[PDB]
Amino acid sequence: AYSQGGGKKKVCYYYDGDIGNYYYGQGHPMKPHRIRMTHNLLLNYGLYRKMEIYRPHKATAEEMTKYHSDEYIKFLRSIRPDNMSEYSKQMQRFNVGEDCPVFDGLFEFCQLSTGGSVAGAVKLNRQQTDMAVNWAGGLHHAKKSEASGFCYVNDIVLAILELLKYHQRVLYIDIDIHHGDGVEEAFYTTDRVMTVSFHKYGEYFPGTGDLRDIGAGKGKYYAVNFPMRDGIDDESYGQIFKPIISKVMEMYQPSAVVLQCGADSLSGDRLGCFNLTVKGHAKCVEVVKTFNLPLLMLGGGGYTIRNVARCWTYETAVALDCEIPNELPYNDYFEYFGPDFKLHISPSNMTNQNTPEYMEKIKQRLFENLRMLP
Amino acid sequence: XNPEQXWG
Ligand code: NA
Ligand code: NA
Ligand SMILES: [Zn+2]
C-alpha cells in the first residue's frame, strides 16, 4: 500500500534476429533492416544489461484470426512470389501487390511482428513486467480483411484483444505521422478501447483522422484525432501532447496502455513532413511513462532508417531510465550514422505551418469531447 | 503513403 508510482520500471524487450532479412523489394521505403540496426545500436550502448530480451514466437493463423478474417489470413499464408500469377484476383481483393507487395517470407515476417506484440501483452497480463517493447510491431494500418500502408497483420489490434482479457479499458496512443486508421476502425464502436492519434491531415495517407471522427455507438467520444499540418516541431508537439494525454488519463482512466512510436514523425523522414527531433519524439514516451500503467511500446513507421535506429534506441533507454551518451558507440552499421555519428538529431529549417493558435484551438475542441465522458 | 509511387 506504500507504492507511489515511481521507481525504475521492469522492461521486457522482444526481438528476432531474422527480422532484418525480410525485404519488401527494390526501392520500397519499408526496410525491416531498421529493426536490426536498432537492436545492434542499443546492444553496443550496453542496454541489454538493464532489461530482459526475449525472442518472440511466430504467431499462428489461429492467433491472427482473432481479428482478421479466415480468408485473408489463408491468402497471406499461401501467397508467394512464385505463385502470384495464379492469385491475381485475390491480390487485388486483399490490397496486396502495390504498396504492400508480395515478398519472400511475407507471412513469417507477419508472424514475427505479431508474435512480439501478443507475447508482450501476455507478459503484461501476467503482471510480470511494467513495459514490453516490440519495435517490429506497430503496423497500425492493417484492416480486418485487407493490407494497407505497408502493414499486413494488425499486431496492435491482436495485442489489445489480448489485453482486454484482463483489463476493462485499454488506451491506444499513436504518434506515427499517419493516422492509425486500422486500430481506430477495429475499436470504433466500443468504449473498452480509446484510440488517440496525432497525425498530419490533409492530402495525406490514409486520408482519415478528422477531428470530427469521435467514434460511434457505445464508442462515441472514445476516438480522439488531432489533425496537424506540415513542419510541427518539438515545442508545438510537446505543448499539446502532455495536456491531451493527461486529460485522457483523467477522464478515461485506463488500466493498460499501448503506445505506437512510429518514427516517420521525425525531421527528415523519407515519407514524413514533420520536424521533430529524437528528444521531442521521446518526450511522448516519458509522458506516458509517468502514469505508471502497464505499457506496451510498439514500432511502426519510419523510413530514414538511421534516424529510426536513433529514435527507438533512445526511447528504449528512456523506458529503462538510462542516460546514454550522445557519442554513438561503434556498431555493425556505424557508417549509416555519418557524417556526425551522434545519437540525437537537429530539426530542419522548414516552416511550421501549425500556428500556436491552431494548436490551442484544436486542443480546446478535443477537451470539449473529452468532457462528454462519464 | 509513398509519394514516389501510387496513392498511398
Ligand atoms: Na498517428
Ligand atoms: Na473506441
Ligand atoms: Zn506512418
Numbering used by the authors:
A (entry chain A): 6 to 379
B (entry chain F): 500 to 507
Give the exact sentences the study uses for this entry.
To address this challenge, we develop a computational “anchor extension” methodology for targeting protein interfaces by extending a peptide chain around a non-canonical amino acid residue anchor. To test our approach using a well characterized model system, we design cyclic peptides that inhibit histone deacetylases 2 and 6 (HDAC2 and HDAC6) with enhanced potency compared to the original anchor (IC50 values of 9.1 and 4.4 nM for the best binders compared to 5.4 and 0.6 µM for the anchor, respectively). SHA can coordinate to the zinc ion in the active site of HDACs. In all the crystal structures we obtained, the thiol functional group of SHA coordinates the catalytic Zn2+ ion with a Zn2+– S separation of 2.3 Å in a distorted tetrahedral geometry reminiscent of that observed for the inhibitor Largazole.
Our first computational method (design method 1) started with docking structured cyclic-peptide scaffolds onto SHA and re-designing the residues in the interface to improve binding. Tens of thousands of conformers were generated for each of the 100 peptides, their energies were evaluated, and those designs for which the designed target structure had the lowest energy were selected for downstream analysis. From the previous pool, five peptides with the greatest in silico predicted affinities were tested for HDAC2 inhibition in vitro, the best of which (des1.1.0) demonstrated an IC50 value of 289 nM. The crystal structure of this design in complex with HDAC2 revealed two distinct binding modes and peptide conformations in the three protein chains of the asymmetric unit, suggesting flexibility of the peptide as well as presence of iso-energetic binding conformations. In two of the protein chains of the asymmetric unit (chains B and C), the peptide conformation was very similar to the design model, but the observed binding mode to HDAC2 differed from that of the design model. This binding orientation interacts with several water molecules through backbone-mediated hydrogen bonds. Rosetta-guided mutational scanning successfully stabilized the binding mode observed in the crystal structure (confirmed by structures of variants Lys4→Glu and Pro3→hydroxy-Pro) but failed to significantly improve affinity or selectivity.
